[PDB]
Amino acid sequence: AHAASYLSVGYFNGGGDVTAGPGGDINKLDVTQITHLNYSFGLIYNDEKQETNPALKDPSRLHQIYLSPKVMADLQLLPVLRKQNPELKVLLSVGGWGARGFSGAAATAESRAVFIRSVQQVIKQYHLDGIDLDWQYPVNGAWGLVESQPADRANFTLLLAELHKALDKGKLLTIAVGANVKSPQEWVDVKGIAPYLDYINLMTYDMAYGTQYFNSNLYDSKQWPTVAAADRYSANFVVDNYLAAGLKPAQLNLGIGFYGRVPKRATEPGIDWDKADAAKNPVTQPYFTARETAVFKAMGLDLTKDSYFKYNDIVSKLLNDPQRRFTAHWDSDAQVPYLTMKSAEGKPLFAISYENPRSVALKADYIKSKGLGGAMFWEYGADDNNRLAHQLAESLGI
Ligand SMILES: CC(=O)N[C@@H]1[C@@H](O)[C@H](O[C@@H]2O[C@H](CO)[C@@H](O)[C@H](O)[C@H]2NC(C)=O)[C@@H](CO)O[C@H]1O
Numbered sequence: 001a002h003a004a005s006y007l008s009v010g011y012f013n014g015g016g017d018v019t020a021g022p023g024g025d026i027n028k029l030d031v032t033q034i035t036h037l038n039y040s041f042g043l044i045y046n047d048e049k050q051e052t053n054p055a056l057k058d059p060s061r062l063h064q065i066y067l068s069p070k071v072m073a074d075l076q077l078l079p080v081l082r083k084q085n086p087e088l089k090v091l092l093s094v095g096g097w098g099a100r101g102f103s104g105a106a107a108t109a110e111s112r113a114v115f116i117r118s119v120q121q122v123i124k125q126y127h128l129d130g131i132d133l134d135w136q137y138p139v140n141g142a143w144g145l146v147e148s149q150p151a152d153r154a155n156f157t158l159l160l161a162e163l164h165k166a167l168d169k170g171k172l173l174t175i176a177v178g179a180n181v182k183s184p185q186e187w188v189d190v191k192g193i194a195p196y197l198d199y200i201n202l203m204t205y206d207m208a209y210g211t212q213y214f215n216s217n218l219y220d221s222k223q224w225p226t227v228a229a230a231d232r233y234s235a236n237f238v239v240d241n242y243l244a245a246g247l248k249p250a251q252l253n254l255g256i257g258f259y260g261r262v263p264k265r266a267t268e269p270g271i272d273w274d275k276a277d278a279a280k281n282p283v284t285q286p287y288f289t290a291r292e293t294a295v296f297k298a299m300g301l302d303l304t305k306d307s308y309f310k311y312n313d314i315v316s317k318l319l320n321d322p323q324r325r326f327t328a329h330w331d332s333d334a335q336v337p338y339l340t341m342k343s344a345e346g347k348p349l350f351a352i353s354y355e356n357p358r359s360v361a362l363k364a365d366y367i368k369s370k371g372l373g374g375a376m377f378w379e380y381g382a383d384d385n386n387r388l389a390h391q392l393a394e395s396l397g398i
């Protein structure tokens, strides 16, 4: 009798990100192509002994939200953006990869109250529509990158329950959750937190690790198969794991990456920790020689430290490389594009996978077919003349 209404939630790296690098220019975004903007990131003043940002170490603001000068400046421009799209909803995202402070902020009644008061303050001062919590990750701590404890799982539920109670009705409360299967199994009580959340952003990307070639494949590749079971991920696999945990599809946004990654398999041996015979590890070996790593290093990508490549840089530096070193291909099973470069032998070497307009449209088709609530994307500053966001808007009828 009537058509569906989908979300398109665009993260924007405005203040800087540990993996994605310095923040970008908010004036370049087309805010008519999205329903929600997650401005990223607020940080958390914390007492973690390994914290290296001294501004977060101010003991008199422990557990409150830190906004850098650029973040404050961008947030003051929101009235201008709203004039271009009066329906736009703007949230502040607190956290991100490597962001400390959540475990301590969630731990006690007193600490949660300080954090919640700070959220309300930031929402009121900048006239925000709500708050997105991007904790990577409760319990696991991103494998020790941030402090964590097993009590984080129950403390996160209490923090969300108490924030939902404190926030004015009509303000939004959302979270991002990881692709790892252990997230719904061990880190986050998805069934217990669902009543408090307007929607949940699934980070269905960053899969190009271990023995897996693809960073954001919708389904598993067969031409370029992942070897170790513990590395075998796809956006669909992640969705099904969250559904099996008890989330309803309409509450979920499928995360879409406006970037690619050079797979770790290209430069580091891949280990299958479930191998019965340890003598058979590593099960994959690097296939980049110094020549290939030097190509990326000259473009500013040091593969010894990171593998993230913005989509607009894929277009300008790889697709349109003057020397024509990269050939684009389509993986019909994975439903995403990828690039190869030629080895000395003339053998094609899998260089990077990413998302193009075709693959974004196919992820929108999945959203519509599976009954998900919408799309989310990381991140708007990495789009190429707003083209991927525009494709999502067209495919979802935004
Ligand atoms: C399937 C899986 O769990 N892959 C892990 C990756 O998620 C992870 O990368 C990190 O993923 C976050 C999203 O969940 C990103 O916010 C973050 O930028 C990214 N970190 C880096 C350095 O790329 C990697 C890193 O530990 O491990 C995989 O196993």
Ligand SMILES: [Cl-]
Pocket: 328, 337, 356
């Ligand atoms: Cl392309």
